[PDB]
Amino acid sequence: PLGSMFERFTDRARRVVVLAQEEARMLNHNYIGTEHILLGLIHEGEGVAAKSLESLGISLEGVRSQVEEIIGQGQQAPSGHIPFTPRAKKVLELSLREALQLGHNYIGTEHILLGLIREGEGVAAQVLVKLGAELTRVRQQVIQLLSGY
């Protein structure tokens, strides 16, 4: 609500966004799309989102390969800040809604992944399906990791 786009993000969730930007830059991409957020979630390596994805066999190299196939490497590397796609912004908005509903005042890696699945229609969703990870199964893995405590 108040403040910066990223005020509520945990340290790990902030690192997801930093990594997403660098993953877009490495592909010579002109936006940070949902698939770069997916790459950042895995790349971050420690959070609930990375754990959920890797335990389903979704790998950083597998996602990078699928993105290069579907989207293709761009011609020129962007310099500076790379803007979000409209879909990636919607994912980030949904991540806040997921965190609020779950009773938290922070947005963690789990909430970004749940927001990504809820949007369910962009490049990340296309890649997860191509790799054999159904969106509902990814959601189930996250919820399982958040439950049972």
Curated annotation (Swiss-Prot):
Residues 9-74 are annotated as: Repeat 1. Residues 6-148 form the Clp R domain. Disruption phenotype: Depletion experiments (using anti-sense RNA) stops degradation of anti-sigma-E factor RseA. Residues 84-148 are annotated as: Repeat 2. Belongs to the ClpA/ClpB family. ClpC subfamily. ATP-dependent specificity component of the Clp protease. It directs the protease to specific substrates. Can perform chaperone functions in the absence of ClpP. Degrades anti-sigma-E factor RseA in the presence of ClpP2. This is ATP-dependent Clp protease ATP-binding subunit ClpC1. The chain holds residues 1 to 145 of 848 of the full protein.
